[PDB]
Design a protein around this ligand. Structure first.
Ligand SMILES: C[C@]12CC[C@@H]3c4ccc(O)cc4CC[C@H]3[C@@H]1CC[C@@H]2O
Ligand SMILES: C[C@]12CC[C@@H]3c4ccc(O)cc4CC[C@H]3[C@@H]1CC[C@@H]2O
Lengths: 248, 248
């Protein structure tokens, strides 16, 4: 019984849409040459800035703040990259063959070749973008999916069985069911038949497994550069996630 | 129009069930000590033997042989490990805390600690097994899911856009929709309401994203041992997949 399981389909949608994060710009001098900037440095700087905003977004996803601090952290540490990728793919949907990492930063596959291992990832992201185009993915659907990833990605890795942990997983699976009801709701409204509904649902959810795959590939690349000497992501997340209530 | 898109739910189920592969045994001398055998050597030998049988299984999955040789190969090269894992998890469903890799080879997490990186994977597989138990996963559902993985895992990585390739992807997405219809069918029969249906469907499909994750982790481990000097999996698959029609 909470301000999460009570909501109706349209309430969840509105909640998710209003919670959407902003679209950041790549930080580079626009009046200066380009073959000067570090593509990676740019992508990394952008991701880091977006993370800060991803936290605000998560806290506004119905049911998320009802969880424990550490559970909230685990889920984000597990899904952060997939969340960034789906957003990226969503933005690029209307730019065939390009990835709109930022309004002032559109890259085609050729531009991903200046870095080892990056070209493969760019092609998977582009292919995902085309898939969405093909499916005519809607913004209402996009938000549900992105919220689904936040909750589902790290739910199978809680290396705990305490009573509290069982109550936590139950809650998560309950919220996910509500998001499922919403997606179906959004489809019935649209005019899709019942068959087309369960079919579109499957099609969308199965894309999530490819997004997971892209994150793993991305984690591999990321983890090959940085070294075991940097505040482990867990902590940064914890610091930003464990906020006080002073700036009332 | 083919012996695939024509079938009815019960026909697909029967097809999938009758096509099930056999349960192989680990090859080791049962009358000899155990701390003697190579855990990895055993797991690798088993997987290799199962692959041979996975090919026969795939060829019997409705719609699979209508695809081109190379497409059939790509899909298997992409999903083989996930297929082995789901099967493994399915077998272990009635053995809390253990992984029944084979009837004569049951291992708990302690036994996975004799090898670097393996303990993490054992825990993800065990957690998946528990999840299925919890969901009371049915054998009819299991086969649909395993078939879904075969078709969905590598469909987003066909680095081709020829007309033939578009016709190939269309076919795959059409078969997948049929498997979706089957799953729903299997649930309505069971007595689940329409809400519980789309909800159970979501729950099952979302598990597939975790199975993908386990494969990536497994591929990382596998790829860290063997060396770039072994008949690349593509070829073994091609050889076994490109069969003649002489043993009529
Ligand atoms: C993490 C990487 C840099 C940042 C990239 C990014 C940065 C911002 C964003 O919104 C999405 C993505 C998706 C792919 C990410 C890349 C995968 C490999 C690279 O290390
Ligand atoms: C591929 C590995 C050996 C074979 C293992 C196996 C072997 C047979 C099988 O039916 C399932 C699995 C799942 C995990 C696999 C392992 C993941 C890491 C290891 O290299």
């Amino acid at each position: 019984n909470s301000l999460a399981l009570s909501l109706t389909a349209d309430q969840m949608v509105s909640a998710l849409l209003d919670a959407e994060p902003p679209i950041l710009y790549s930080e580079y001098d626009p009046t200066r040459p380009f073959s000067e900037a570090s593509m990676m440095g740019l992508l990394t700087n952008l991701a880091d800035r977006e993370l800060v905003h991803m936290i605000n977004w998560a806290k506004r996803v119905p049911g998320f703040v009802d969880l424990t601090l550490h559970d909230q952290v685990h889920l984000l540490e597990s899904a952060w990259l997939e969340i960034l990728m789906i957003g990226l793919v969503w933005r690029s949907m209307e730019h065939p063959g390009k990835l709109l990492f930022a309004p002032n930063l559109l890259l085609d596959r050729n531009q991903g070749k200046s870095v080892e291992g990056m070209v493969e990832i760019f092609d998977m992201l582009l292919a995902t973008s085309s898939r969405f185009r093909m499916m005519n993915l809607q913004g209402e659907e996009f938000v549900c999916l992105k919220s689904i990833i936040l909750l589902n990605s790290g739910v199978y890795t809680f290396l705990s069985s305490t009573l509290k942990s069982l109550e936590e997983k139950d809650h998560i699976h309950r919220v996910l069911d509500k998001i499922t009801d919403t997606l179906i709701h959004l489809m019935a409204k649209a005019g899709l038949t019942l068959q087309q509904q369960h079919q579109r649902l499957a099609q969308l959810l199965l894309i999530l497994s490819h997004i997971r795959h892209m994150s793993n590939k991305g984690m591999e690349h990321l983890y090959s550069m940085k070294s075991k000497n940097v505040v482990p992501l867990y902590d940064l997340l914890l610091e930003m996630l464990d906020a006080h209530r002073l700036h009332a």
